[PDB]
Amino acid sequence: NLPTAQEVQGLMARFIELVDVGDIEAIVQMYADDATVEDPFGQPPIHGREQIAAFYRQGLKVRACLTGPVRASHNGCGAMPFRVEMVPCALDVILVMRFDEHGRIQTMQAYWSEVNLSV
């Protein structure tokens, strides 16, 4: 059901793993069929697995890793810091995710902008 704190840490860390290897399909499957995503938060929310899949396929020679432990709540929520290394540029990002009673991402917000870009 709704992921407990420990379960959030697990799903979210796994997410970074998926993004890291670039397994698009596995990514999309982690999301609820109608999940929404704002990455970067504020411009603009995409909806559903088809658009999410297009988004990730669009983004993924890319590597990502946790730069801190996953922070989790008890109401199916979580946040985590991580970094993606593309091109020789690097991007620090923090994601906030809300899971549903099925353990799948309902919403995800990515926080970052040029100020978190390096190279």
Which residues contact its own copies by CB under 8 A?
5-6, 9, 40-43, 67-69, 71-75, 77-81, 92-94, 96, 111-116
Task: Select 55 or 111, whichever has its Cβ closest to its own copies.
Answer: 111
Give the tokens for residue 11.
């799903």
Give the separation between CA 84 and CA 18, rounded to whole angstroms: 12
Task: Select 24 or 82, whichever has its Cβ closest to its own copies.
Answer: 82
Rounded to 5 degrees, φ, ψ at 109 are -125, 130
Q: How far is the CB of 70 from its own copies (least distance, A)?
A: 8
Give the separation between CA 10 and CA 12, rounded to whole angstroms: 6
Task: Select 53 or 110, whichever has its Cβ closest to its own copies.
Answer: 110
Q: How far is the CB of 73 from its own copies (least distance, A)?
A: 5
Q: What residues contact residue 64 under an 8 Å CB cut-off, 6+ apart?
A: 16, 19, 20, 82, 83, 84, 85
Give the tokens for residue 16.
């970074």
Q: How far is the CB of 69 from its own copies (least distance, A)?
A: 5
Q: How far is the CB of 54 from its own copies (least distance, A)?
A: 22
